[PDB]
Amino acid sequence: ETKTVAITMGDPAGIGPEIIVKALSEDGLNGAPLVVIGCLATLKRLQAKGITPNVELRAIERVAEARFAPGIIHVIDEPLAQPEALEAGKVQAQAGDLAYRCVKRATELALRGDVQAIATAPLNKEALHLAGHNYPGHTELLATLTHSRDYAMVLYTDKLKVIHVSTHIALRKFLDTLSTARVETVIGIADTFLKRVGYVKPRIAVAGVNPHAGENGLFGDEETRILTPAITDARAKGMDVYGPCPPDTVFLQAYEGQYDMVVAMYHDQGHIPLKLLGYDGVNITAGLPFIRTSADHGTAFDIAWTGKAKSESMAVSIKLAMQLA
Amino acid sequence: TKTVAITMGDPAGIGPEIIVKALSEDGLNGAPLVVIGCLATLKRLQAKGITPNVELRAIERVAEARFAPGIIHVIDEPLAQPEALEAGKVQAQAGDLAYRCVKRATELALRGDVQAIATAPLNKEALHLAGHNYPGHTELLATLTHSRDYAMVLYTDKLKVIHVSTHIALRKFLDTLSTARVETVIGIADTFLKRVGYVKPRIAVAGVNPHAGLFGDEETRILTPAITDARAKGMDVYGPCPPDTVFLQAYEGQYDMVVAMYHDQGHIPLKLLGFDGVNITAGLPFIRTSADHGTAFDIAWTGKAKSESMAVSIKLAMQLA
Numbered sequence: 315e316t317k318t319v320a321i322t323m324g325d326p327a328g329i330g331p332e333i334i335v336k337a338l339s340e341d342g343l344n345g346a347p348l349v350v351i352g353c354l355a356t357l358k359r360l361q362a363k364g365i366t367p368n369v370e371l372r373a374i375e376r377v378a379e380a381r382f383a384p385g386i387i388h389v390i391d392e393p394l395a396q397p398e399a400l401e402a403g404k405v406q407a408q409a410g411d412l413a414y415r416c417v418k419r420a421t422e423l424a425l426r427g428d429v430q431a432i433a434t435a436p437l438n439k440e441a442l443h444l445a446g447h448n449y450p451g452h453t454e455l456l457a458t459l460t461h462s463r464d465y466a467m468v469l470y471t472d473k474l475k476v477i478h479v480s481t482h483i484a485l486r487k488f489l490d491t492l493s494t495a496r497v498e499t500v501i502g503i504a505d506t507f508l509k510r511v512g513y514v515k516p517r518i519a520v521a522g523v524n525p526h527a528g529e530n531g532l533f534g535d536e537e538t539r540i541l542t543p544a545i546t547d548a549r550a551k552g553m554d555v556y557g558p559c560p561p562d563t564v565f566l567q568a569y570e571g572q573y574d575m576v577v578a579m580y581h582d583q584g585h586i587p588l589k590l591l592g593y594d595g596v597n598i599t600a601g602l603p604f605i606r607t608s609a610d611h612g613t614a615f616d617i618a619w620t621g622k623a624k625s626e627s628m629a630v631s632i633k634l635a636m637q638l639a
Numbered sequence: 640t641k642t643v644a645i646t647m648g649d650p651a652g653i654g655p656e657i658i659v660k661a662l663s664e665d666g667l668n669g670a671p672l673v674v675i676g677c678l679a680t681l682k683r684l685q686a687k688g689i690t691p692n693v694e695l696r697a698i699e700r701v702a703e704a705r706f707a708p709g710i711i712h713v714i715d716e717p718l719a720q721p722e723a724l725e726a727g728k729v730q731a732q733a734g735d736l737a738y739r740c741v742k743r744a745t746e747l748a749l750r751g752d753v754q755a756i757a758t759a760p761l762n763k764e765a766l767h768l769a770g771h772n773y774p775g776h777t778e779l780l781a782t783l784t785h786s787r788d789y790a791m792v793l794y795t796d797k798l799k800v801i802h803v804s805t806h807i808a809l810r811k812f813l814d815t816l817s818t819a820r821v822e823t824v825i826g827i828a829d830t831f832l833k834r835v836g837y838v839k840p841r842i843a844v845a846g847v848n849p850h851a852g853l854f855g856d857e858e859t860r861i862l863t864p865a866i867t868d869a870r871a872k873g874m875d876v877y878g879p880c881p882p883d884t885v886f887l888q889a890y891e892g893q894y895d896m897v898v899a900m901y902h903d904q905g906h907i908p909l910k911l912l913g914f915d916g917v918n919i920t921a922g923l924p925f926i927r928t929s930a931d932h933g934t935a936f937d938i939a940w941t942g943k944a945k946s947e948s949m950a951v952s953i954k955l956a957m958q959l960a
Contacts, residue, residue, distance in 0.1 A: 358813050587908075
């Protein structure tokens with residue numbers, strides 16, 4: 315019946331703690347089925363410095379032990395080694411270790427179904443490495459812990475949904491490592507994500523790599539060599555998938571209601587159209603065994619613990635977890 | 640003052656058809672416009688009852704034109720054999736006419752007899768058969784006009800974009816990108832913008848890689864040197880900017896123009912806001928505009944080709960002349 319989201323603290327030297335408490339004070343998050351995984355001592359300490367606003371914090375050992383009520387945040391206490399020793403906005407091994415242990419604990423709760431979705435506050439890669447946790451980044455850490463090779467970034471709005479074959483890599487890199495297997499995988503993830511969120515027979519449009527999907531009313535090299543084989547393979551498997559479509563009309567058409575989702579090829583191909591319309595700025599990592607959301611800012615060490623950080627996107631990313639759980 | 644020359648393009652295609660239709664519209668009807676094409680084929684077109692009825696007036700010189708509603712002035716650049724013209728066919732005489740109209744318009748423009756050109760589409764196959772070896776409409780003009788460098792501009796009131804490259808594959812674009820070419824397009828943009836009334840243009844340059852870069856070297860190796868060079872010449876240029884916010888910020892008013900790297904970078908944003916079918920070729924000595932349609936040989940001379948684009952193309956050339 316009831317669906318619960320785990321929220322991970324991230325790097326406690328960053329803005330994670332303060333943006334969670336703030337976000338949780340907002341209507342529709344206040345007293346909601348949410349559990350914070352993080353350092354209880356650190357949360358008490360930030361409240362006492364007046365950073366964090368006033369709220370009752372209740373430790374629980376198990377998710378089921380929560381008694382949800384406005385004005386109470388429930389916490390699975392993963393402790394910082396020395397809470398009194400934490401400095402705002404510096405790279406610290408114990409803060410990177412805590413960040414690691416929270417996402418570890420969150421995925422364990424998800425794996426046994428105590429929690430249905432996860433919203434992650436940001437962590438610092440350099441601190442993670444300093445703690446001896448060797449992962450290329452937050453998302454990759456989630457994927458390793460979860461034994462998921464196959465995941466992709468989703469931008470989710472009412473009117474436009476986009477999943478990316480690739481994100482955060484040079485354009486030359488994207489062109490040189492593009493493969494049929496990857497496109498196929500991402501189409502699969504798109505199909506599964508959309509059914510999980512209640513599209514019984516989703517329409518997926520696949521964007522071309524090249525302008526117009528090619529020149530002179532012919533598909534281009536990637537389109538015919540890589541994309542068409544993935545589309546064809548995916549239709550034969552029962553998926554309602556179209557393309558390759560001209561990049562400069564495909565997102566417009568999905569926006570206008572012709573498709574439920576677009577498979578974008580590279581980062582900017584998907585992010586340009588999302589941001590140009592009225593993005594907030596949250597993303598879903600699709601292809602894990604549970605829904606996971608995060609926001610696009612980082613730890614913001616320069617403004618951590620000053621009351622300047624904005625909790626808007628942390629809030630959006632938590633409400634989104636709840637919706638899609 | 641400002642007068643605009645309109646070229647016929649390939650007479651077998653939709654050029655003649657849509658020129659006539661568009662010039663019947665309000666704003667274009669009786670406006671300072673000179674068509675350069677074969678009077679005889681425009682006559683033939685008229686007899687077929689596929690257009691509004693209009694009086695055609697042969698002029699040898701632009702100063703002869705007497706602008707009034709319901710009269711289109713033509714500079715008679717004749718087809719070698721007007722009666723032998725078939726619709727939607729690749730014909731040597733048709734491509735040769737397309738070439739002479741362009742040549743003729745550019746001569747008038749270069750001279751100041753006209754202030755802008757708006758082109759109707761031509762057929763490259765037909766152009767090569769007539770012995771004119773040019774890769775296309777735009778390259779033809781660059782040559783006739785001694786302009787090594789030009790770039791495509793998409794022009795709206797709130798968002799304006801110039802392109803380092805267009806149409807080509809992503810890989811081709813990556814492999815043929817250079818600092819020199821970025822410097823050139825920044826300079827074309829600056830010059831274009833002053834020409835349309837921005838005394839001090841503010842120009843943004845889009846990155847190649849997501850977040851204009853740690854991911855790829857074009858920003859530091861190609862884009863930054865070009866921008867540093869632009870700013871040392873007194874231009875107000877920003878970048879490289881994350882492609883996923885720069886067009887948004889241009890749209891909001893932060894920049895007068897964005898220099899896009901490749902086709903979709905500029906076209907995704909423009910189509911998404913709901914704007915066609917037209918562009919400006921910038922970097923020539925005068926304004927040229929055109930629309931994205933080809934000769935449409937399959938529907939030519941039936942009356943079914945849309946003239947809207949062509950009308951916008953001409954309206955824009957007038958505005959900017």
